[PDB]
Structure 1
Amino acid sequence: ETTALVCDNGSGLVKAGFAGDDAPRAVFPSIVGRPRHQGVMVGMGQKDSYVGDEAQSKRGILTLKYPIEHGIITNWDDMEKIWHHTFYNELRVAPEEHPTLLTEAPLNPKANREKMTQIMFETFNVPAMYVAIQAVLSLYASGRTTGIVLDSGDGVTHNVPIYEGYALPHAIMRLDLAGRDLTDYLMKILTERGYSFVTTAEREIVRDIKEKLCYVALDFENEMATAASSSSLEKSYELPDGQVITIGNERFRCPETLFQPSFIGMESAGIHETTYNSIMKCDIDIRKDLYANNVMSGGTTMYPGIADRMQKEITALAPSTMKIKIIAPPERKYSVWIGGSILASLSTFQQMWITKQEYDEAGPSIVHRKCF
């Protein structure tokens, strides 16, 4: 009992490591694949189930399925399998030796929290654990006490206004739009270009393509016009088979779905509009502080130029009499994990944990009252 482990069950990726380290010791995607063919050879009876980078490597003969969908778990067996894999094969640390820290998106059903706590306390018999929010850990990592969080993850995008020493639970907005919808739209448009991708392996391929050759556009109409003069924007990507795909307007089209949800058909508003509404719902005095500090985190906000576009949109919407600043740290991908590690390292938090004795005597409902 010297340190604790912080695990972030990201909608598309899993981050884990020791409390104190500045970088995670295990970064693998949440994939639980199973064989799709029959199998003929006799000299292998291997691993009916597959998880982790192994699944990514041999994805061509497997039906990859994401255990977590838009922040809510759908298959508990897959999640338990991934937990076991991360704890034993990668970390090689017994659950009893150290406690575990878990994080989840806001406005999630209580059933998920109760089931997760029960499974953690019963199966792995962890000495203690806790449940927190990714945005607050982002604040802790950023070393700030006031601001607004843009936690645009792979499965969920949400904001949580905060003030010195307190939060505003009544001004929390959660948007289902996230990286998965962007990937689906990218596949749909790549179909309109002439390239077809359906199965999950090509889903991973398109995910990589978006990760490597996508960016946001300051002006949509101007970019479209310059695309009409398509002689300096098209770029080529090399597929595993060697085929070359040329991508033009699709580079700056899919990211615009974040600011224009109507493309997918969702009757909602963009991230800028939702943040403006959330800040407006707050008290007048704290609006200045919230404007002066705007923290963003998540893997969906690494597109170059996103910060500039958000700043321009907010300044256009907000009155043109003050200053709006956007802070874009270059390590926002692991901000949640860093915040969790720092929070665990805090001396005052050594007593806020939830132990087996109190959990057993009280019941699963205790976590509900533990910091909401």
Structure 2
Amino acid sequence: IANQPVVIDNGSGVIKAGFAGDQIPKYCFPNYVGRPKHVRVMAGALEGDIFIGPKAEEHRGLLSIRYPMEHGIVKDWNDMERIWQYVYSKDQLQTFSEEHPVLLTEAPLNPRKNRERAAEVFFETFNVPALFISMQAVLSLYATGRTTGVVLDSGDGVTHAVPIYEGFAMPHSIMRIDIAGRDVSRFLRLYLRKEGYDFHSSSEFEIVKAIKERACYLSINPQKDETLETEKAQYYLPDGSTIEIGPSRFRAPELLFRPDLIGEESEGIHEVLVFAIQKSDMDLRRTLFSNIVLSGGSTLFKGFGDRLLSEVKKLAPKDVKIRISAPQERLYSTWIGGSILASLDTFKKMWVSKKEYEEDGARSIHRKTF
């Protein structure tokens, strides 16, 4: 029976999971995989060697945590099933795959081997009878209510500026250059290497990401604020020590708009989005110039969208209505948008049923996902 469907947002840095109808995915944790470091000899430790959530956050430097979804490329399939199982566990779902429908998420340009591989999971290992998987940008559109908007997500290593029109993302205009703050924080670790600090452990790097999400912003003036002398704000170490910040809090995110700092032939999100704009109807661009759909977790900086506004001003001509539509519960905005989509009743068709998967599998999906 089509029970309460589960909206599972597979965000790059943080995966989200919760039943539809709800407003908060009660079962969330970041997108990682945590295996231990040492060998517990005495008891009093946990068992399973795959510790997620409070165990992971608890045993941070005790676990040699890793990350499966690498710019939308996940490879820990079996452990992914165990992650879902961790959600399927008494901790988070307490239910079965067969019992409740599943609303899973996606990103563009994904290899159908991996997509159908996930279908093998939820139809063979797990046995979801009502599983539908789709983009997260449309979910953000449900949240904003806008239908003709250019959605760009901001995760940890995923940034796809997708221009959508009335719920129809033009594939010829869809832009997917999934790379974000992952290497920015890695380059900040390089700053720390140029400061004498290594964060080669993921948990060691998790603290870097915590301060990254915490003590960082977007200095709208790039070289002006870059050439000025920073103050090197002493930020507390988690043990109780304290270390400076420097330009890094704004100097490292300059790489987002200036990909050449890492040495990458890219153009900066704004220009990529302008390229997406170029591949459309001229009149619709003016709407999209004002239909600035912000999304993703990395859209949490001071002067973030305003520096982006300056980028647009350097890109868009005069008498162009520019209008940022920033959300607030960004990653959950897509999750709640999925709660809206999963609540639909016409929605029962294109989801691959279990028998539908038994029919062809691959082409049944190909035709039902397209």
Query: Into which bin does the TM-score normalised by the smaller protein fall?
Result: over 0.9
More deviation in 50-59 or 15-24? 50-59
- Residues 152 and 297 of structure 1 are in contact (CA less than 8 Å); yes or no, is this contact kept in structure 2? yes
Query: Aligned partners of 1:9, 1:281: CA distance in 2, in Å?
Result: 28
Change (3 A) 1:44 1:286: closer
CA-to-aligned-CA distance 1:27-84 (integer Å, 9 cap, x gap): 1123322222233325667223322231121021221111211101112121111010
Query: Aligned partners of 2:127, 2:358: CA distance in 1, in Å?
Result: 12
CA-to-aligned-CA distance 1:204-243 (integer Å, 9 cap, x gap): 11010111100001102221343x2x4xx43222112211
Partner of 1:335: 333
CA-to-aligned-CA distance 1:286-331 (integer Å, 9 cap, x gap): 2122112010100111112111111121122111122211111222
Secondary structure of the 1:73 match is coil
Deviation at 1:111, TM superposition (A): 0.6
More deviation in 151-160 or 30-39? 30-39
CA-to-aligned-CA distance 1:255-279 (integer Å, 9 cap, x gap): 1110000111111110011001110
Q: Does 1:102 pair with 2:104?
A: yes
Partner of 1:279: 277
Change (3 A) 1:94 1:322: same
Deviation at 1:180, TM superposition (A): 1.0
Q: Does 1:72 pair with 2:70?
A: no
- Residues 117 and 364 of structure 1 are in contact (CA less than 8 Å); yes or no, is this contact kept in structure 2? no
- Gaps spanning 5+ residues in structure 2: where? none
Partner of 1:8: 9
Q: Does 1:56 pair with 2:57?
A: yes
1:189-338 → structure 2 map (5 Å cutoff): 189-226=191-228, 228=229, 230=230, 233-338=231-336
Change (3 A) 1:61 1:2: closer
- Gaps spanning 5+ residues in structure 1: where? none
Query: Aligned partners of 1:24, 1:48: CA distance in 2, in Å?
Result: 26
User: Aligned partner of 2:349: which letter?
Assistant: Q
- Residues 30 and 82 of structure 1 are in contact (CA less than 8 Å); yes or no, is this contact kept in structure 2? no
Change (3 A) 1:360 1:306: same
Change (3 A) 1:348 1:37: same
User: Aligned partner of 1:90: which letter?
Assistant: Q
More deviation in 188-197 or 19-28? 188-197
Secondary structure of the 1:195 match is coil
Partner of 2:160: 158
More deviation in 44-53 or 156-165? 44-53
Deviation at 1:18, TM superposition (A): 1.2
Q: Does 1:174 pair with 2:176?
A: yes
Secondary structure of the 2:244 match is strand
- Residues 36 and 65 of structure 2 are in contact (CA less than 8 Å); yes or no, is this contact kept in structure 1? no
- Residues 8 and 102 of structure 1 are in contact (CA less than 8 Å); yes or no, is this contact kept in structure 2? yes
Partner of 2:143: 141
User: Aligned partner of 2:311: which letter?
Assistant: E
Q: What fraction of aligned residue pairs are identical, expressed as a percent?
A: 53
Partner of 1:38: 39
Change (3 A) 1:63 1:146: same
User: Aligned partner of 2:269: which letter?
Assistant: I
State the superposition RMSD in angstroms: 1.7
Query: Aligned partners of 1:45, 1:251: CA distance in 2, in Å?
Result: 37
Change (3 A) 1:38 1:166: closer
Query: Aligned partners of 2:71, 2:288: CA distance in 1, in Å?
Result: 27
Secondary structure of the 2:15 match is strand
Query: Aligned partners of 1:315, 1:187: CA distance in 2, in Å?
Result: 32
More deviation in 152-161 or 141-150? 152-161
More deviation in 205-214 or 236-245? 236-245
CA-to-aligned-CA distance 1:3-35 (integer Å, 9 cap, x gap): 210111222212111111111111112332222
Query: Aligned partners of 1:44, 1:323: CA distance in 2, in Å?
Result: 59
User: Aligned partner of 2:281: which letter?
Assistant: D
Query: Aligned partners of 1:165, 1:273: CA distance in 2, in Å?
Result: 23
Partner of 1:114: 116
Secondary structure of the 1:68 match is coil
User: Aligned partner of 1:164: which letter?
Assistant: E
Deviation at 1:131, TM superposition (A): 1.1
